Write a structure and sequence with these properties.
The PDB classes it as hydrolase. The entry lists the keywords serial femtosecond crystallography, hydrolase. The assembly is monomeric. Crystal structure of hen egg-white lysozyme. By secondary structure, the protein is mainly α. The chain has a single domain, classed as Orthogonal Bundle (Lysozyme), CATH 1.10.530. The chain contains 4 helices and 3 strands. It binds chloride ion and sodium ion. Sodium ion binds next to loops.
Amino acid sequence: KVFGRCELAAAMKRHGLDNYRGYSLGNWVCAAKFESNFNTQATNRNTDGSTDYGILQINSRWWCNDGRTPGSRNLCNIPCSALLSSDITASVNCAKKIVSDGNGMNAWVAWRNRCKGTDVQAWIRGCRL
Ligand SMILES: [Cl-]
Ligand code: NA
């Protein structure tokens, strides 16, 4: 599913992401936009053999199992395929685990290079929240 900007914002807010670990809603919508262009079915393979999945491009090296990333962890306890669902619940729950691990949203390269230090509030501006 390809989310609308406001539609995803409302979805993320409902799942408890607004202000989660101090990150305002705008930060999450911004990350999703530049990681996956709001496409739940986005996948991208990395040089180390791992793959990033879903709206938040969560990595199979640590967070989910895709059966093809030798010696990897599954810290979210889920199949990576579950991160591609139209229902963002799995991705949200796993992202909460990732942002809690100590590096905050810096774990998302796109967020660090394109959202951090920017007016992220612009990503939810005009939305009925
Ligand atoms: Cl932080
Ligand atoms: Na894995």
